[PDB]
Short mmCIF file of C-alpha atoms in Angstrom, two decimals:
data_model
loop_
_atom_site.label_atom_id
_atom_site.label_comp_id
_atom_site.label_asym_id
_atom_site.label_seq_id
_atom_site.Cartn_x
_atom_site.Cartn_y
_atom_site.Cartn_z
CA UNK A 21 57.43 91.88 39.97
CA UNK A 22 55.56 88.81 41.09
CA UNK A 23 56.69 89.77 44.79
CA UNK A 24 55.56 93.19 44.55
CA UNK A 25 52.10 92.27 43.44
CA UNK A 26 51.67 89.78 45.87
CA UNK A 27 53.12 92.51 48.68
CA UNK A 28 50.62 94.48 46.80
CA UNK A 29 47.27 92.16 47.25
CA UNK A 30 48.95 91.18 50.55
CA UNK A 31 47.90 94.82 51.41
CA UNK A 32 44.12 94.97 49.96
CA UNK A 33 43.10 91.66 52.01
CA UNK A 34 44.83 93.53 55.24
CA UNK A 35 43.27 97.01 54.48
CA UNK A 36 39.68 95.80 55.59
CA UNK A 37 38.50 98.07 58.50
CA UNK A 38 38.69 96.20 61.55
CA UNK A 39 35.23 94.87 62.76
CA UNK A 40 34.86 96.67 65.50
CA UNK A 41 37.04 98.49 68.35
CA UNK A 42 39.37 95.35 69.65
CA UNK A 43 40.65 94.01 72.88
CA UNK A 44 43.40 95.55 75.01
CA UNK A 45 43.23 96.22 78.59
CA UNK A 46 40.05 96.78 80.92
CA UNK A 47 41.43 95.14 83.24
CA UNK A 48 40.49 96.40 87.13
CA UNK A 49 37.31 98.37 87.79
CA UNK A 50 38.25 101.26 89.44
CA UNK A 51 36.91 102.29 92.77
CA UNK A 52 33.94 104.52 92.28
CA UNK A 53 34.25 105.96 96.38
CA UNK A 54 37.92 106.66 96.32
CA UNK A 55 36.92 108.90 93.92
CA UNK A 56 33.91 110.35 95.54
CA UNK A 57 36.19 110.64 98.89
CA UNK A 58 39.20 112.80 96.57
CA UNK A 59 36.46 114.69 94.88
CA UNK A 60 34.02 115.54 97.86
CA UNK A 61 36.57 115.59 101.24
CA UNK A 62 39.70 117.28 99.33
CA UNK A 63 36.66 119.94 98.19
CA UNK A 64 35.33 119.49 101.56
CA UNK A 65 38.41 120.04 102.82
CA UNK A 66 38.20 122.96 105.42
CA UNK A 67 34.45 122.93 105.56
CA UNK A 68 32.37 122.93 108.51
CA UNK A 69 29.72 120.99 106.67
CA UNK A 70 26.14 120.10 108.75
CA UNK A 71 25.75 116.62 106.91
CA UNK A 72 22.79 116.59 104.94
CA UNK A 73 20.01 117.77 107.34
CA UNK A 74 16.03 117.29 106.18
CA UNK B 12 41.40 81.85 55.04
CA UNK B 13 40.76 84.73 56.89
CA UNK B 14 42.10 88.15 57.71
CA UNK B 15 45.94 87.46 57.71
CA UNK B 16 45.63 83.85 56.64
CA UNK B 17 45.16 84.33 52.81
CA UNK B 18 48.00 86.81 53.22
CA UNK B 19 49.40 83.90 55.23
CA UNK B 20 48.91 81.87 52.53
CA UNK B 21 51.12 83.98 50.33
CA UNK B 22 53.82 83.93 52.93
CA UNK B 23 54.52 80.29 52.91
CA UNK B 24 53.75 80.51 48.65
CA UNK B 25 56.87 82.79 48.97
CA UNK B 26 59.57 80.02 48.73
CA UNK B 27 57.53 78.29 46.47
CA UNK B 28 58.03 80.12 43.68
CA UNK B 29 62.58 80.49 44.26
CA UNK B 30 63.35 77.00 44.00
CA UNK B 31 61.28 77.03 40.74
CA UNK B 32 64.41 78.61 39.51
CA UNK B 33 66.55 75.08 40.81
CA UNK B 34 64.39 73.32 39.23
CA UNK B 35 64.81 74.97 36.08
CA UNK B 36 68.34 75.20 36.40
CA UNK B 37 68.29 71.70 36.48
CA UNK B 38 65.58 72.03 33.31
CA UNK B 39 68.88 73.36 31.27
CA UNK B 40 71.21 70.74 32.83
CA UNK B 41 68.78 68.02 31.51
CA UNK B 42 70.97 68.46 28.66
CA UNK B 43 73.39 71.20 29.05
CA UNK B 44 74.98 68.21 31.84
CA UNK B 45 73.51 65.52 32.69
CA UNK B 46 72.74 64.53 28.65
CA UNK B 47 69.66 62.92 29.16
CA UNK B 48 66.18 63.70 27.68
CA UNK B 49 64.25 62.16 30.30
CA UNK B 50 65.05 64.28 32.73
CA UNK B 51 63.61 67.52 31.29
CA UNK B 52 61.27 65.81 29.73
CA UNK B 53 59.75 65.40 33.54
CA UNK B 54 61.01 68.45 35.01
CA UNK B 55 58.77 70.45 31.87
CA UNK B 56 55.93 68.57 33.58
CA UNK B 57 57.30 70.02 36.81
CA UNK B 58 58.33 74.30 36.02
CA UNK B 59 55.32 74.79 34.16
CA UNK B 60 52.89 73.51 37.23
CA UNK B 61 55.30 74.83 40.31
CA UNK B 62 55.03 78.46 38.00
CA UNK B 63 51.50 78.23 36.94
CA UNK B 64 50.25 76.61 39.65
CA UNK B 65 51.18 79.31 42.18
CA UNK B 66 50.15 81.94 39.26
CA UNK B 67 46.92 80.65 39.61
CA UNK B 68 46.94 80.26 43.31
CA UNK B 69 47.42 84.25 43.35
CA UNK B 70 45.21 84.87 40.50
CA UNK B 71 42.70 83.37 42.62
CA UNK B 72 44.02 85.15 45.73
CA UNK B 73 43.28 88.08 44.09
CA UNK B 74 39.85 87.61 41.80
CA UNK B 75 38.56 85.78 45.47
CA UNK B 76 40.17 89.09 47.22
CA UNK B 77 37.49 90.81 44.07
CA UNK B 78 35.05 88.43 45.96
CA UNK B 79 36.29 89.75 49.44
CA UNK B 80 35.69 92.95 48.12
CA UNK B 81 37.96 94.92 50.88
CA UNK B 82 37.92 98.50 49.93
CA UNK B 83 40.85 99.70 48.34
CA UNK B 84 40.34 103.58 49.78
CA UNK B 85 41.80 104.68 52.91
CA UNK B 86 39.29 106.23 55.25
CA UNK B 87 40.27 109.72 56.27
CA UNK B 88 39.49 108.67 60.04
CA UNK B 89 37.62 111.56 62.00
CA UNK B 90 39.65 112.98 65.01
CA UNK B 91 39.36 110.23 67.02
CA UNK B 92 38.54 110.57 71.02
CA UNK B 93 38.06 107.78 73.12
CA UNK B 94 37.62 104.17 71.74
CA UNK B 95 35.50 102.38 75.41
CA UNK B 96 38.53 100.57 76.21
CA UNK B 97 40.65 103.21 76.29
CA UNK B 98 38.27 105.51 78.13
CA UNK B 99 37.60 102.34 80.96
CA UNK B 100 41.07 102.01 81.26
CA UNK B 101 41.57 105.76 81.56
CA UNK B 102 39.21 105.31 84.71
CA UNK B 103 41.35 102.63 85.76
CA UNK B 104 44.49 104.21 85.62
CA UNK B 105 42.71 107.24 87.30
CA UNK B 106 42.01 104.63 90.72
CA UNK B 107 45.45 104.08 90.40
CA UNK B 108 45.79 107.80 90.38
CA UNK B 109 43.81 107.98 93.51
CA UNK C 4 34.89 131.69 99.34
CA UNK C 5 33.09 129.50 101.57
CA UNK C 6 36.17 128.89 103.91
CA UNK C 7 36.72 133.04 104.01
CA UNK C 8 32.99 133.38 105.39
CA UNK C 9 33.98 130.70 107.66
CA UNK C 10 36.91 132.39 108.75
CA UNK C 11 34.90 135.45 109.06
CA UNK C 12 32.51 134.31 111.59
CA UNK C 13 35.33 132.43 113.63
CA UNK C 14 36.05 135.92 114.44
CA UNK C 15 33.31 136.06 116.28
CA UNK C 16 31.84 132.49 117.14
CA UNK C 17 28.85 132.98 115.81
CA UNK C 18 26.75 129.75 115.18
CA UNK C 19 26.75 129.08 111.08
CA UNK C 20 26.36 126.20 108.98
CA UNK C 21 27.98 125.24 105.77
CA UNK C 22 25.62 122.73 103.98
CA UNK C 23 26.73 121.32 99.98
CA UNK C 24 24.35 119.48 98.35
CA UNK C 25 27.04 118.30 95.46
CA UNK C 26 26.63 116.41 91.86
CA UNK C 27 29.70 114.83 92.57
CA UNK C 28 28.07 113.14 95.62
CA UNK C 29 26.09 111.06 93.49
CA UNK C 30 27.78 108.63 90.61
CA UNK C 31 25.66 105.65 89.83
CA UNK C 32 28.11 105.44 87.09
CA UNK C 33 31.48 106.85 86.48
CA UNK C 34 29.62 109.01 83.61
CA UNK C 35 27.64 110.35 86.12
CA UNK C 36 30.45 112.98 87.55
CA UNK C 37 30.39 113.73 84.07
CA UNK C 38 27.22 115.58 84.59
CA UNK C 39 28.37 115.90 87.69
CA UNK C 40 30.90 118.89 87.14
CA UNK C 41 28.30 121.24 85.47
CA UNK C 42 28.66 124.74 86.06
CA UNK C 43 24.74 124.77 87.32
CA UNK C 44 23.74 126.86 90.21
CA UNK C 45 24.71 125.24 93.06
CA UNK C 46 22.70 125.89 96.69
CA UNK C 47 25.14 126.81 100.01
CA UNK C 48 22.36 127.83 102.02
CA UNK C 49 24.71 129.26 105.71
CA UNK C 50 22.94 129.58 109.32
CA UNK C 51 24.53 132.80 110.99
CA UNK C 52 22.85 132.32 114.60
CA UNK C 53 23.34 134.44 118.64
CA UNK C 54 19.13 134.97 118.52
CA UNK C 55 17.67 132.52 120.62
CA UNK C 56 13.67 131.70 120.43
CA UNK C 57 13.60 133.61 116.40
CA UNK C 58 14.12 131.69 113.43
CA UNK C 59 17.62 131.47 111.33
CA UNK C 60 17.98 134.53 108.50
CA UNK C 61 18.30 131.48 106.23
CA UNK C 62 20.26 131.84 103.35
CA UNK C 63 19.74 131.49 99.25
CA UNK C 64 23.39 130.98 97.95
CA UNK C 65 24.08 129.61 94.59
CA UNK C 66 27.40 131.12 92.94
CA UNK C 67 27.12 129.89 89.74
CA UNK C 68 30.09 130.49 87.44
CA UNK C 69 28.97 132.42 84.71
CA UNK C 70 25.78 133.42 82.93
CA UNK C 71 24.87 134.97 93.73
CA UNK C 72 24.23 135.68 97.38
CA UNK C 73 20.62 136.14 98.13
CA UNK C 74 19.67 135.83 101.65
CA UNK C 75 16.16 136.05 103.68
CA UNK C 76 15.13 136.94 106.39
CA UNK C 77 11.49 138.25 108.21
CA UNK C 78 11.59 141.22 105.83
CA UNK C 79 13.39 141.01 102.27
CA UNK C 80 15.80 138.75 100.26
CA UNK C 81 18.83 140.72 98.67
CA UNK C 82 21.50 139.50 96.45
CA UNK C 83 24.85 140.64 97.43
CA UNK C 84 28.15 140.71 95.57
CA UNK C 85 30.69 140.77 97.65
CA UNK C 86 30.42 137.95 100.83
CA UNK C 87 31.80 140.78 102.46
CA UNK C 88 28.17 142.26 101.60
CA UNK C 89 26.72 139.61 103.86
CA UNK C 90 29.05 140.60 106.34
CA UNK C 91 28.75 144.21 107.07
CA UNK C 92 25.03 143.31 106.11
CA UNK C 93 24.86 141.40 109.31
CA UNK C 94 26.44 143.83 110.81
CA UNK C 95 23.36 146.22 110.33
CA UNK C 96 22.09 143.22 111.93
CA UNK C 97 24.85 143.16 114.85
CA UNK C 98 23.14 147.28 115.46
CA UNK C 99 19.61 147.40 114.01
CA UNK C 100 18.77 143.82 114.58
CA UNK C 101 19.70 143.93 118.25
CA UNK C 102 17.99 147.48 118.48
CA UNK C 103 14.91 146.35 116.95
CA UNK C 104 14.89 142.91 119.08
CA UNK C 105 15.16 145.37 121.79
CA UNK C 106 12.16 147.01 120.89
CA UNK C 107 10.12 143.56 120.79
CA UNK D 9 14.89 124.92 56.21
CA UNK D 10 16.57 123.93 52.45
CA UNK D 11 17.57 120.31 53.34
CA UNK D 12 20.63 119.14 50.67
CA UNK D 13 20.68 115.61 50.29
CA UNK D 14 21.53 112.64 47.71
CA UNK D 15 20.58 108.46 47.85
CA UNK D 16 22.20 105.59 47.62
CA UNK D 17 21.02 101.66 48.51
CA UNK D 18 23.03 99.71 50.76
CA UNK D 19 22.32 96.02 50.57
CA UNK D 20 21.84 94.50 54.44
CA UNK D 21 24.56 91.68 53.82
CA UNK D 22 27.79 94.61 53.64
CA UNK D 23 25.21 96.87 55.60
CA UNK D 24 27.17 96.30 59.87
CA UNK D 25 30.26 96.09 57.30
CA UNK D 26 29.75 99.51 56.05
CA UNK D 27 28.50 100.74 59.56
CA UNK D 28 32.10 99.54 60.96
CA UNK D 29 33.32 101.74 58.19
CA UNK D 30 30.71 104.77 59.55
CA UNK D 31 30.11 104.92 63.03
CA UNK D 32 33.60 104.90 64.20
CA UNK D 33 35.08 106.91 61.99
CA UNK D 34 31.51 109.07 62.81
CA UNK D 35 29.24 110.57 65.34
CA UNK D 36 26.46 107.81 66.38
CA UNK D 37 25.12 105.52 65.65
CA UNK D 38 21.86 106.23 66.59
CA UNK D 39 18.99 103.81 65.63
CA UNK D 40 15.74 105.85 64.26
CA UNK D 41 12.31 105.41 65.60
CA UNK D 42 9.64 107.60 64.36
CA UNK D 43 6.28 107.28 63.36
CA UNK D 44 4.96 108.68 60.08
CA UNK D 45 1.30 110.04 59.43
CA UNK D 46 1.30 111.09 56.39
CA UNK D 47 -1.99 112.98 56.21
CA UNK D 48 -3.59 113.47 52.16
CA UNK D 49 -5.37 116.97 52.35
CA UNK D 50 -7.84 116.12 49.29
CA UNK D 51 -8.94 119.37 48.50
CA UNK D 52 -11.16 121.34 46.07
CA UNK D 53 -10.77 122.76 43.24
CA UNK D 54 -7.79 121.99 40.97
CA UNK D 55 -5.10 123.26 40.50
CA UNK D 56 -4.21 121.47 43.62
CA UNK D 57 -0.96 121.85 45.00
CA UNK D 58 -1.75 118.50 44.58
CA UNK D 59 2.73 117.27 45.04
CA UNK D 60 3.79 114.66 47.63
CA UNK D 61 4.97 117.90 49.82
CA UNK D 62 1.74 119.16 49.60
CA UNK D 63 0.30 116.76 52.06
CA UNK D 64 1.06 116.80 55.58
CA UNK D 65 2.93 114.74 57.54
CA UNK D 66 2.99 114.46 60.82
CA UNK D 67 5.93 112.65 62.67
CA UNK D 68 5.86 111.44 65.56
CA UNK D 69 9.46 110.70 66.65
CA UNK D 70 9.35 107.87 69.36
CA UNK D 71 12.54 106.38 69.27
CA UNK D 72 12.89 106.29 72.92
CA UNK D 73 9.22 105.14 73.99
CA UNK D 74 8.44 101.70 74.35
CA UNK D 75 6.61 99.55 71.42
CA UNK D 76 3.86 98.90 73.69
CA UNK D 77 3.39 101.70 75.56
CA UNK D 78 -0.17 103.38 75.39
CA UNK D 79 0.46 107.02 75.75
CA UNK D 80 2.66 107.80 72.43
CA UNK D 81 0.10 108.46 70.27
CA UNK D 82 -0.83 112.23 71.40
CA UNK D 83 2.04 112.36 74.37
CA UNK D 84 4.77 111.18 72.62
CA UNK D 85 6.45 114.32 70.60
CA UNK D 86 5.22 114.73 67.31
CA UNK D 87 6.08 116.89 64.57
CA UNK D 88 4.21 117.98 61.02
CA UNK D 89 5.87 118.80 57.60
CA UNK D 90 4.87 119.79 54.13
CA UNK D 91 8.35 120.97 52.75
CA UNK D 92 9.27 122.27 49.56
CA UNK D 93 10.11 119.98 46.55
CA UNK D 94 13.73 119.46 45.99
CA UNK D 95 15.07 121.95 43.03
CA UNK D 96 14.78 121.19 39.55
CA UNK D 97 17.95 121.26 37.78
CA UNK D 98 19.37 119.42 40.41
CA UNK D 99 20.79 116.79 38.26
CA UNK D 100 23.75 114.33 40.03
CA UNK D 101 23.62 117.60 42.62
CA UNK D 102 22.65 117.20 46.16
CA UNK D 103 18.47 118.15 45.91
CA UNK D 104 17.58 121.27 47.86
CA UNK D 105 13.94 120.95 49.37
CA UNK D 106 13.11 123.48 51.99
CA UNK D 107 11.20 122.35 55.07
CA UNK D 108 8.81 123.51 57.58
CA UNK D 109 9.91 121.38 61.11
CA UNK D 110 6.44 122.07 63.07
CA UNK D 111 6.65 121.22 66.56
CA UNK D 112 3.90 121.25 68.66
CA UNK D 113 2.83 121.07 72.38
CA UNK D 114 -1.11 119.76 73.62
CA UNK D 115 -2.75 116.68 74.71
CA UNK D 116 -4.51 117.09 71.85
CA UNK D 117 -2.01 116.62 69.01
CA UNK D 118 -3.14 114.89 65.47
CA UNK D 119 -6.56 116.22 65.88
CA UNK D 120 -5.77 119.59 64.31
CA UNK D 121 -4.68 118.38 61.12
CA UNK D 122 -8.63 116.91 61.23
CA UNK D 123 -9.00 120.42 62.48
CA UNK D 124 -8.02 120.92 59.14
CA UNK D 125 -10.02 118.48 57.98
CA UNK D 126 -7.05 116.39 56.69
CA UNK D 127 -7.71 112.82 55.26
CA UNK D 128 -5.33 109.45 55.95
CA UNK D 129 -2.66 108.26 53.57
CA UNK D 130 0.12 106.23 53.29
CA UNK D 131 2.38 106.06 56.57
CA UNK D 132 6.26 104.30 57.40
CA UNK D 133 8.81 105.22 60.33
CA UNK D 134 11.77 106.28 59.95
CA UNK D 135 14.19 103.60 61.30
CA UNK D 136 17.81 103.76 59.73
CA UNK D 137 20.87 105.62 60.91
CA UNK D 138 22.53 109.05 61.48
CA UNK D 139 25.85 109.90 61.60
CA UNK D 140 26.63 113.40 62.78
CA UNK D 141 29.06 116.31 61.04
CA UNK D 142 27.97 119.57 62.51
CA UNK D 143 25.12 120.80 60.56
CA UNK D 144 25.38 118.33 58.28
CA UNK D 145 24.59 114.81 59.10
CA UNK D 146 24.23 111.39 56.81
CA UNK D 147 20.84 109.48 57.52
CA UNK D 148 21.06 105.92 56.39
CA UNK D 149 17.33 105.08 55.39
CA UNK D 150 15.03 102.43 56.98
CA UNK D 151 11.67 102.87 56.43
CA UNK D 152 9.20 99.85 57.89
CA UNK D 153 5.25 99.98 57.03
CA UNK D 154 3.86 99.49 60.47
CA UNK D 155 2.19 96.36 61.24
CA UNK D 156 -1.29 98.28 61.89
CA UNK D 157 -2.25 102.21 61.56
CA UNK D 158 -1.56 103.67 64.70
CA UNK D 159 0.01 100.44 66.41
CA UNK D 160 3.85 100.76 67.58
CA UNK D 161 3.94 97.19 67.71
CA UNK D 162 6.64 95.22 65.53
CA UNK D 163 7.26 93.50 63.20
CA UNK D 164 6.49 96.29 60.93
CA UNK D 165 6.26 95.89 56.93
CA UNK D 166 9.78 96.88 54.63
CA UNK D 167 8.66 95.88 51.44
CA UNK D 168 11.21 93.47 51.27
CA UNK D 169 12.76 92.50 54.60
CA UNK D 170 16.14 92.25 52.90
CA UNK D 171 15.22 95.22 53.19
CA UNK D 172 17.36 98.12 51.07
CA UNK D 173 19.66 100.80 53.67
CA UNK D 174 18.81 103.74 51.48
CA UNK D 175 21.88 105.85 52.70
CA UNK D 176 21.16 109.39 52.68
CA UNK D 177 23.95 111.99 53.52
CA UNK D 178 22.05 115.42 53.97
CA UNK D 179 22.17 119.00 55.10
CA UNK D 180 19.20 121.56 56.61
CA UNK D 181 19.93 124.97 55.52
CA UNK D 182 18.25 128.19 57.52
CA UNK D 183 18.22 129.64 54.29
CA UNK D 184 18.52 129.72 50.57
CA UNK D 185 19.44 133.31 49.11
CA UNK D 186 22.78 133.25 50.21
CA UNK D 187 25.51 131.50 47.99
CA UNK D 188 27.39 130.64 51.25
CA UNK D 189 25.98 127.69 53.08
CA UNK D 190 25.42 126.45 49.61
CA UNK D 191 28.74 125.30 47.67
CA UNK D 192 30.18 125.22 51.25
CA UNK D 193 27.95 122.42 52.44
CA UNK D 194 27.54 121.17 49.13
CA UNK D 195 31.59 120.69 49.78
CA UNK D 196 31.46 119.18 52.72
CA UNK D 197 28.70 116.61 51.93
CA UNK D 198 31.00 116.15 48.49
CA UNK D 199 33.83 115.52 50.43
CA UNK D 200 31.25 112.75 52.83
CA UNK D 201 30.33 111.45 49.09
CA UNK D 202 34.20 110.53 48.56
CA UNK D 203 34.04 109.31 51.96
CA UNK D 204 30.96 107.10 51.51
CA UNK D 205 32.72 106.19 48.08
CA UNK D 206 35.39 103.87 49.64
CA UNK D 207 32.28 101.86 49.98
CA UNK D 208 29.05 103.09 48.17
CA UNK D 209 27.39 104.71 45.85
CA UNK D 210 25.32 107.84 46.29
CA UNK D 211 23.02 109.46 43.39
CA UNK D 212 20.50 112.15 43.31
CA UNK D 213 17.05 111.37 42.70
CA UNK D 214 14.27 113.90 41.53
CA UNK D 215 11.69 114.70 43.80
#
């Protein structure tokens, strides 16, 4: 009975929130232009754009 | 003791308290066996402190778990959507799926 | 849409110009293209062109997706529907136009 | 607008503590910036309306402008209120005060309340937190006395700076004749109550 309330307050000092959102991976900025490059030329794709003109 | 380590604490208390049970064993073979008052007559001033002892090691785990004051409620979370990390990472698996 | 007006004028060579102006161009962050798929009105602005010394009918085109082809010229803007609207609209161009040039 | 709302006091030392056990299980956080004019109309004759409601308040929310910057103080958006008192016979039950959100849009911006005529009283700022559900949305009170009348500049003036988070789940209904919005919301906001009571307290208080 002993081990089941210790099991027991075992479980009220580990049911705390945690303090905050907590470390995984973020590793490796991704590229912001590849993106730009899939996004705009495969939209672009087939396009006789005129650049940007004034 | 912190997070896991007052829980930790309990963990290595854990096979404190089994060998009490030797010890008391021994606490009727004071006697029962080995025929000699002495014997008991130490290991009395030995069960009653390895039992107690821890008792009041986890009494204290607990009324200093009352000073912790962890809630005892489980939060019903709200649909969670993307925690930064996993939204970052997201981006970085989506270079990766350039 | 943009690629079957294309293919419409490569019928007939006629000088024309495509011209985005896109969100997604711009990203100072990567929760800018956030913002920067918005369904907002987006400007396509096309320069159909055989008249010489006169200035372009230029073009108001912003096909929105809910809630869209407007040109101009030296007399009155005028949404169309279809881009085949545009078309056979230039087309009163490829007769009048030329008839009333030949007036000039 | 019949805002539904309760109180509770959050002591600053389990304050982030009880945040950690808000804001991600919650819309926000969102710190509050706003400051209060609340205007005394002293008026004759009696029987003055004479209740808290009954003079104005203008409120200037500024959360975003800087604490030095010069413009706020009739550029910055403002805002007026009056409201209704909260119902009586709202014992232990969410109070129900219906409110007038003015909103207004001139260079000229306090002056009409002196256009009324409108005398100075006691002002604060709103400065505590507010965690979104739909409609509904809990506002965690601070409420600083600012360091000079019209001056943005901090440190501003909690009466105690252990200063008391007067948590504040509330409501803004369109309308009070219909029974919907009422237990519904009054549900809802229960249901944040059991929420808020894995780690607080919440009361009514009479106003």
């Amino acid at each position: 009975q002993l081990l089941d309330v210790s099991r027991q307050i075992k479980s009220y000092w580990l049911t705390n929130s945690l303090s905050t959102s907590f470390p995984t991976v973020d590793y490796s900025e991704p590229d912001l232009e590849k993106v730009k490059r899939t996004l705009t030329k495969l939209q672009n794709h087939l396009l006789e754009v005129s650049l940007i003109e004034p | 003791s912190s997070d896991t380590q007052q829980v930790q604490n309990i963990l290595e208390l854990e096979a404190k308290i089994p060998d009490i049970l030797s010890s008391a064993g021994k606490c009727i073979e004071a006697i029962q066996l080995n025929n000699s008052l002495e014997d008991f007559r130490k290991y009395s001033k030995e069960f009653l402190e390895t039992v107690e002892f821890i008792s009041t090691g986890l009494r204290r785990q607990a009324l200093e778990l009352e000073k912790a004051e962890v809630p005892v409620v489980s939060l019903q979370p709200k649909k969670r959507y993307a925690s930064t990390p996993l939204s970052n990472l997201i981006f970085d698996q989506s270079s990766k799926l350039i | 849409e943009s690629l079957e007006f294309q293919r419409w004028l490569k019928q007939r060579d006629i000088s024309f110009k495509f011209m985005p102006n896109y969100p997604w161009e711009k990203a100072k962050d990567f929760l800018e293209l956030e913002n920067s798929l918005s369904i907002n009105r987006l400007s396509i602005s096309w320069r159909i062109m055989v008249s010489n010394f006169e200035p372009a009918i230029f073009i108001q085109h912003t096909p929105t997706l809910h809630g869209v082809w407007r040109c101009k010229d030296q007399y009155s803007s005028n949404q169309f529907s279809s881009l085949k609207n545009v078309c056979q609209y230039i087309e009163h161009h490829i007769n009048s136009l030329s008839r009333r040039s030949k007036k000039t | 607008m019949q805002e539904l709302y309760l109180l509770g006091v959050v002591p600053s030392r389990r304050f982030e503590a009880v945040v950690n056990s808000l804001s991600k299980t919650l819309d926000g956080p969102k710190t509050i910036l706003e400051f209060w004019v609340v205007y005394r109309p002293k008026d004759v004759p009696p029987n003055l309306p004479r209740q808290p409601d009954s003079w104005l308040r203008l409120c200037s929310n500024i959360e975003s402008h800087d604490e030095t910057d010069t413009e706020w103080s009739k550029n910055t958006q403002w805002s007026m209120y009056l409201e209704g008192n909260s119902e009586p016979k709202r014992e232990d039950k969410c109070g129900i005060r219906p409110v007038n959100r003015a909103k207004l849009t001139n260079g000229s911006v306090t002056e009409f309340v002196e256009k009324m005529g409108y005398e100075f009283s006691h002002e604060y700022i709103i400065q505590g937190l507010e965690y979104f559900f739909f409609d509904t949305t809990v506002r965690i009170y601070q409420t600083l006395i600012p360091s000079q009348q019209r001056s943005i500049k901090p440190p501003f003036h909690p009466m105690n700076e252990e200063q008391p988070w007067i948590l504040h789940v509330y409501t803004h209904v369109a309308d009070a004749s219909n029974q919907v919005a009422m237990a519904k919301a009054e549900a809802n906001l229960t249901k944040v109550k059991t929420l808020l009571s894995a780690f607080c307290d919440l009361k009514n208080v009479r106003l």
